[PDB]
Amino acid sequence: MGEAEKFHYIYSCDLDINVQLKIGSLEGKREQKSYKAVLEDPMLKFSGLYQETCSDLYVTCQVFAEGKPLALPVRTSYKAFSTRWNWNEWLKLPVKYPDLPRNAQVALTIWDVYGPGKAVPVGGTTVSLFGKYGMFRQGMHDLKVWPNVEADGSEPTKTPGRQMSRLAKLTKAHRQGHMVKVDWLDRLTFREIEMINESEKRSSNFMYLMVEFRCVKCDDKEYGIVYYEKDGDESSPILTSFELVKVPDPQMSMENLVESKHHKLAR
Amino acid sequence: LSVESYFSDIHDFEYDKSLGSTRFFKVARAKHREGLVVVKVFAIQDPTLPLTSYKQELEELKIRLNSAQNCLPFQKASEKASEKAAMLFRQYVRDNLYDRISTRPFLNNIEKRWIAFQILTAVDQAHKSGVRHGDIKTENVMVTSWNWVLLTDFASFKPTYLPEDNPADFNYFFDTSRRRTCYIAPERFVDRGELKRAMDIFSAGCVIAELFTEGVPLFDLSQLLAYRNGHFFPEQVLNKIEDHSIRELVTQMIHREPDKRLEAEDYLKQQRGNAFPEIFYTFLQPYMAQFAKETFLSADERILVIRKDLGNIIHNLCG
Numbered sequence: 120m121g122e123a124e125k126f127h128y129i130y131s132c133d134l135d136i137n138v139q140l141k142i143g144s145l146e147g148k149r150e151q152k153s154y155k156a157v158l159e160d161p162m163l164k165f166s167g168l169y170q171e172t173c174s175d176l177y178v179t180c181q182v183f184a185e186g187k188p189l190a191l192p193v194r195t196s197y198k199a200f201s202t203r204w205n206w207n208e209w210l211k212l213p214v215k216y217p218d219l220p221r222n223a224q225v226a227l228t229i230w231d232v233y234g235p236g237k238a239v240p241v242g243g244t245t246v247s248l249f250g251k252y253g254m255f256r257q258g259m260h261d262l263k264v265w266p267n268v269e270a271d272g273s274e275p276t277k278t279p280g281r282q283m284s285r286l287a288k289l290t291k292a293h294r295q296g297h298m299v300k301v302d303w304l305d306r307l308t309f310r311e312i313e314m315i316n317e318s319e320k321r322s323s324n325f326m327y328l329m330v331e332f333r334c335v336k337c338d339d340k341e342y343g344i345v346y347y348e349k350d351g352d353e354s355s356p357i358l359t360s361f362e363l364v365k366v367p368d369p370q371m372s373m374e375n376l377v378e379s380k381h382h383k384l385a386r
Numbered sequence: 387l388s389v390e391s392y393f394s395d396i397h398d399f400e401y402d403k404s405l406g407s408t409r410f411f412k413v414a415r416a417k418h419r420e421g422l423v424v425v426k427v428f429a430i431q432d433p434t435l436p437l438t439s440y441k442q443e444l445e446e447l448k449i450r451l452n453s454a455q456n457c458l459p460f461q462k463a464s465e466k467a468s469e470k471a472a473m474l475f476r477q478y479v480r481d482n483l484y485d486r487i488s489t490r491p492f493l494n495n496i497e498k499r500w501i502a503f504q505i506l507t508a509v510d511q512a513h514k515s516g517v518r519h520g521d522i523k524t525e526n527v528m529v530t531s532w533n534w535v536l537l538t539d540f541a542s543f544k545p546t547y548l549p550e551d552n553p554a555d556f557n558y559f560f561d562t563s564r565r566r567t568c569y570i571a572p573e574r575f576v577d578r579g580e581l582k583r584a585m586d587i588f589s590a591g592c593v594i595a596e597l598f599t600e601g602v603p604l605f606d607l608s609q610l611l612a613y614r615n616g617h618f619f620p621e622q623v624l625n626k627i628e629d630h631s632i633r634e635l636v637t638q639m640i641h642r643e644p645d646k647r648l649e650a651e652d653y654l655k656q657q658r659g660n661a662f663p664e665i666f667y668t669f670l671q672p673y674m675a676q677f678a679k680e681t682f683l684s685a686d687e688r689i690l691v692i693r694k695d696l697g698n699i700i701h702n703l704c705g
């Protein structure tokens with residue numbers, strides 16, 4: 120009938136393993152081929168836009184926190200593309216779960232060849248690594264790609280990856296089984312969502328980079344990674360007495376570090 | 387009886403250290419639920435003496451100096467805690483100014499100015515409250531590790547008037563450091579009065595001198611008795627004060643005739659801007675007071691209060 124409802128989770132500061140991000144497929148069309156621009160810039164004909172229907176794009180994944188990069192960007196391994204951009208590659212990020220603060224993001228940039236020794240950004244997308252209540256993102260996510268720009272790692276990001284937006288979530292919930300199934304009704308409703316989707320395909324030149332996050336499994340359980348800090352349970356033993364000690368001093372019984380620095384330099 | 391022996395009978399206060407034994411009080415550091423505390427233990431050798439006169443006084447100093455942010459009265463007093471001993475309780479502070487002058491980091495000019503400013507603020511606070519500190523000394527000026535001054539050990543049980551003839555009264559109650567230093571205002575020498583606000587201004591002025599001479603005492607007992615008779619003026623030590631305006635403040639405050647010694651508030655009015663930066667009156671005294679007394683701001687919350695106020699702080703201090 121069904122396994123139980125227990126919610127299992129691990130603290131992010133307890134999961135000392137590298138974060139891994141799957142770069143799935145890049146759906147959508149590119150910015151056509153504006154031949155006006157090529158007459159102005161002949162180097163532009165020697166660029167992935169104009170050489171193949173699917174240039175061999177690559178993605179760089181970098182983690183940012185407080186607008187600063189936590190480590191170097193990781194690049195997808197070369198994959199030759201012909202009719203679709205499908206890297207299908209798990210990227211081991213240089214950051215571990217304990218290393219990630221609550222506002223850690225991954226800035227993902229799709230890059231293309233622009234003449235010799237020059238990559239142009241096809242687009243960029245940034246998604247926060249923790250959810251609205253501090254749970255590491257799980258499973259398959261489709262991120263809005265911002266054309267002709269690198270992913271922005273600043274806080275707040277200017278390239279967030281997160282009608283069809285709402286419906287896709289409901290569709291994913293339906294496919295996972297969280298939405299109730301009604302065959303007569305699902306058959307009719309999804310045709311409309313398809314019409315909406317096709318209209319959005321024609322209306323806008325949007326691209327989506329589908330990515331996936333790893334699932335933490337142990338004994339066939341599913342653990343969500345919730346953001347925590349070690350000692351996060353240490354509710355400080357604050358007490359409101361001031362009978363004798365009216366003026367607390369935090370440095371009270373502490374090594375004088377300016378004298379020890381001096382000791383270490385004179386003696 | 388050793389200083390520690392007294393604490394064997396007390397449960398609430400566990401001995402920690404001795405701060406110094408003198409025939410007047412034996413002083414110990416004690417650990418308490420609240421923090422570290424100084425216990426001044428008075429061996430009450432003659433039970434005939436009425437300590438009820440001193441207990442009343444201290445309970446009215448404790449009330450008056452309750453809101454005086456730079457004064458630290460004795461917070462507790464216990465006539466019979468060990469049956470042959472009384473005890474005065476107050477918090478223990480990081481430094482005392484006499485030691486702080488030598489500990490690192492050495493006090494800048496602006497930090498000495500901030501300490502002298504707060505000494506005058508403490509005297510002004512107690513004097514407005516109706517309290518006199520009948521011996522200000524650098525030992526009794528206490529410094530938190532954030533350089534909040536607490537004036538402590540209010541000398542309400544010490545004699546206001548001393549004979550010049552017999553140094554025995556000075557040796558007992560005053561000069562417990564045994565440095566022979568004498569900041570007791572010269573008119574306090576004769577041959578149970580009330581203490582006068584100018585008797586603190588001489589005491590405070592001499593502490594600001596010693597602060598700015600890096601611990602050279604402005605007078606000792608013979609030099610104060612000569613200054614009392616007009617046969618000596620501490621020009622040499624005053625010339626060790628590196629700042630002309632603090633030099634004149636001190637020369638004003640240590641004035642021989644008490645009538646020529648202003649209120650602490652007047653010295654702080656006269657010294658606005660010139661000795662004491664304008665920013666001391668406008669930003670640092672009121673801002674730093676949020677950390678000061680019966681306040682409840684944790685080390686973790688202190689840093690967040692200062693981070694959240696950084697921009698405002700930078701504007702006031704710098705511009």
Ligand SMILES: Nc1nc2c(ncn2[C@@H]2O[C@H](COP(=O)(O)OP(=O)(O)OP(=O)(O)O)[C@@H](O)[C@H]2O)c(=O)[nH]1
Nearest residue numbers: 405406413424478479480481482525526539562563
């Ligand atoms: N750091 C620190 N030192 C203290 C404290 N209380 C006392 N001491 C030190 O121990 C010494 C002995 O204590 P006291 O009896 O208060 O010395 P004092 O200031 O000469 O005492 P009185 O003559 O009564 O004013 C003082 O001079 C200080 O140097 C304190 O709360 N903090």
Ligand SMILES: CCCCCCCCCCCCCC(=O)O
Nearest residue numbers: 428437440441463464465472543
């Ligand atoms: C309960 C109140 C405790 C008060 C503690 C201070 C008492 C000081 C008494 C000083 C007596 C001096 C005697 C003498 O002159 O020999």
Ligand SMILES: [Mg+2]
Nearest residue numbers: 525526538539
């Ligand atoms: Mg004292």
